[model samples]
Target: GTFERLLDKATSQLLLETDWESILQICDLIRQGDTQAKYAVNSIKKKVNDKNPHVALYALEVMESVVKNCGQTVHDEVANKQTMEELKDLLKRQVEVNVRNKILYLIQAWAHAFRNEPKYKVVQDTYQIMKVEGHVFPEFKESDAMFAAERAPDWVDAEECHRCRVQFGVMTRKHHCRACGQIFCGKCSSKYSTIPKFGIEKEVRVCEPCYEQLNRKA
Candidate 1:
């Protein structure tokens, strides 16, 4: 409760200030991990969506700094559908040029930074969609898209389904869930879903547990 209150206090200051120093202070507060990041980003989202241009800029700055410094926990929340949709709307509709400009650049950079990571791929997808529709993005390093790799579990040695734990017969083929990296039988893993954390842009085989967990976030 106190952390939420602290986050609220930071955003409240952001709602009024034009001074970069005071605003950057809030970023530092969040980046240092004193405040809960989910609350921090959600509050920042509301401010960014504020029709008032100055407040939106301040919140974007906070989002930028926190995403840059606050580690993966913050990155996951900031790139979720809730925050991303507002960004899309901010660009699609008329707003202050600078606000749109900030989003354009941020999305562009995130597009490259989170390019291969499954859950964060929407940022890359969003950038591509906007680019095709004639949105110009600020330049960023091409290498941001190249990050660490994930090792998928070896399906070749598996003998049983990870979900149902059934023995693999000739009729039951091994299917690897991109989300869990667990092997499953075709019947158990028949459903395909977008597992973004696995860089799965399109629907792919995901185990029941992973499918449920992924949908719960929505």
Candidate 2:
């Protein structure tokens, strides 16, 4: 009776709940190798397509944690092509830039995880998933604002302009390549292009190498 009640409450909480932290906590419990966690897993997965993009994105984040914590046990739910179908649609249709990018990243990660499965035969579809590119999100293509400042990995030590490899200093301002997420100087990354690979429909700052690659693709 206790276990049954627990499952029922978990299911109800996940379905009716609005508190994200509680949802995540419930998700963690589900990830602890519990067979009954299937309800939560499916519940979370369903939210991936929620009409609300914020709801959908948070659901995805919880799903990722579930898969990461559950390891191979949840592989069938996460690794298969069916699991990625909704995500692909979101990648193409979600209006929120962050939502679309996060969905694509999740799809890419899931596909890579099972590409070499010995019994699952996931490679073919996963390879196709890998090839599906571009996003509607434009800002995701840009470098971190903090990159210019002395903070995070984007700033300091072993850091060099991605294009010129110039060391950053008072004169050589550090910038990030919108396409590659690497640090570059303003001049090196000055060129602009529509980086389809990153789903930026508009021209954004890109490094020289990425600039050339975009041109070649065009």
Candidate 3:
């Protein structure tokens, strides 16, 4: 609900333009549901593509704010092949410097921060393609902006196990994966492992995807 307004030009300037903590506050709301995540990304796509480049950087701030907070869900939306390619198009099509450089900065930051993704890691793919094509990128050094292990997600909206897509029925029980909250169904969340980032010393139930996801870089 607030996300749509957060993407609006005036609202973004006041709340999302430079106030990252404000964005993280918005991220808390985003982490509560999948629909909001989808809506936010789609709206952001339109925002960044606006004719006015100033709005494009506002979109960048909005984009960066969620970079580390909801990496599991937001990453899927922003780093999708289609979206990354759209970003590539933006980089190529920009006639000015600010939006152009900010695009590259965000690209580099996403790849560096989201390196642990077990899936396509589309941002990394796009980075290599642009690097080879002779497009320049900043050496955005390692920073606190790196993704954190998502806190246990909202349980109400997760109807099925993320890995298997099986419904959580009467017979099947839901297990909260320590790393990404999207997990459900014990069959998929069969592994018990320590999520070091969450200060989890004792092994806890984790899903297969997040098992591999955390195995790589958590």
Candidate 4:
């Protein structure tokens, strides 16, 4: 409850004020510890979808600071399956190359923090392509798209499938498009396939449009 109120105030202040000093203050607050940091991180995350580039960048900077300052705690936050998915989505739709790069860097940082451990090898594999070829790697484009799909919101948040607009209910199971991460009714996103671009060797759910797009790319 305390963190919620604090986050609300920080988010409101950040959104309303254009001044860099105030923005920096809010960022500092998030960097102080886990409670404020996690809330600020997630709040700023939703802002990635903002139409205003300035606001979106503002949010990204706050997120960056949180990750940068919180160290392993921030890494833990980023390591969550949902968090990674959301970051991937942000990378996909973000028009600014710099912002996408920042998102990728965050992922790399999380992986770097855990490189010594064995459990994170899957994550390491996710970006090993980057490590081998660096930024110039041709597969980077596909990796961006793959991570983009992971950014989709969880099924409970979906009111209806994006493709068919069918309301989610007991009968209409919600599914996620592996290509873009949007919610879809099971029938609409019925196709399943592996996306090498995303480093996913196993078959996964995919919406029709993305399925066709992937096929076209192939």
Candidate 5:
């Protein structure tokens, strides 16, 4: 549609006019996971060579902020604070559910860049003492395993199964899924549970009950 051309014109005008608010608004669109705004973002970044460095810096700041909020740009095997914070800010400030979801997705996607440390000695001891199944590191298969293997060495390594006092594992990884803040394991991975088209692999961490419950719901 013509929206792309219109978007470029509007962004260019804002940059040239020195309209900080408009520039930020356009940046917000880009930060909100709008890939189409890449050109404007890059254009703004190039202006760092301008006499008014802050202008270009502003655009970079927006990019960095968005990157920080989502915890993207895993450089040196460490999390990118800029992307993480940026995504977090968007998630917090955005009222729209779909927008927030996209923001969350972006953050999660960026987190994939981080490298997971291998099983630590202390972590191994903790797992043994705790008898945590998640410590074993749920199996991964095919592309899912390949992607996860790159960045996921350790998981959230949090407490688990409060009801039964069952620990997930010293190395157990968890993500706050769309369902809520509640953490799940490979058992509840919505594979057999929800019957999605996605492949079922070993690394899927789903709780047994969630596994059963989702299946029932499905």
Candidate 6:
């Protein structure tokens, strides 16, 4: 009878599977602070291979929802910013390779979904490091900042003033060109030749011509 009971328990547990409706239910329960959802998540985590890819994806959605709902209780932090970070640590430390693979795939998906999120910036930066060190993605060239330096005229680089180049001292000054988005030093800033009606204290970098050419409306 004891063996039969054990089999029955195992079968009941095995019946717990990942499904769209179940996933939504789990998420709703988690949102309501149902502690039992923890057990449900753990149980399904073991049988991740039992379901189709959609189920796995749904599981991830459930996890994210739970983390989002539980807030600081999940990480002891107010902002809940560490939700993904902690989840990431758990998934990486998992012993099962397939489980880890599924979690990692979910992580990649999560990363893609929230790449622009302020909290996930660290994760995106981590991905960047992985790409640079492990060469996970192909190499590509990064473009310049587009805006010219503030000091193109005065402090140094008068000749290079007309163009944005290897410049640094510009940032120290208050020079600013709303039209061209430059912050040239006093001298380099004046190199535009055609001084504006506004004084240097105004911190305008580009001349009237540049303002007309680039930003005619303003």
What TM-scores do the predictions have?
Answer: 0.57, 0.47, 0.62, 0.45, 0.25, 0.33
Per-residue lDDT tens digits for candidate 5, residues 1-218, read 23334334433424644344544455455546554444544453344223343343343344433343322221211233343444344445655554444434333333332223231123223323323432122222233222323221233334663224345775654442222225555444343332222333333444455455544533
Better of 1 and 6 by lDDT: 1
lDDT of 3 by residue, 1-218 (tens): 56665457333534434655556666776887734777777777787887777777777777777756775678778766887889999988998798888888888877765654546478788888888989888766767434754445554457787778888878877778776766577788788877655556688888787787677754
Count the clashes in each prediction.
5, 1, 0, 2, 33, 11
State residue 77's C-alpha deviation in candidate 1, in Å. 0.6
Q: Which run of 10 residues does model 1 get worst, by summed lDDT?
A: 143-152
The root-mean-square deviation over C-alpha atoms between each candidate and the true structure, in angstroms, is 7.7, 12.1, 9.2, 15.6, 18.5, 16.7
Worst 10 residues of 6 by lDDT: 140-149
Instruction: For residues 1-218, write the lDDT of model 2, one tens digit per residue.
Output: 44334333433424554345554555556655444555666777766777776667667766766665554556566666576565666666878987767766655455444433444445336446446543332233223211112211233334677657777888877777666678878887789887543346688877788788767655
lDDT at position 112, candidate 4 = 49
Most TM-score-accurate candidate: 3
Residue 130 in candidate 3 has what lDDT? 86
The window of 10 residues in a row where model 2 has the poorest summed lDDT is 144-153
- The TM-score of candidate 1 is 0.57
Best by lDDT: 3
Off by over 4 Å in 2: 1-24, 31-37, 119-124, 127-218
TM-score: the better of candidates 2 and 6: 2
lDDT of each: 0.71, 0.58, 0.71, 0.60, 0.37, 0.41
Candidate 5: regions farther than 4 A off: 1-20, 31-35, 65-218
RMSD value for candidate 5: 18.5
Q: Whole-model lDDT for model 1 versus the true structure? A: 0.71
Judged by lDDT against the true structure, how good is candidate 6?
A: 0.41
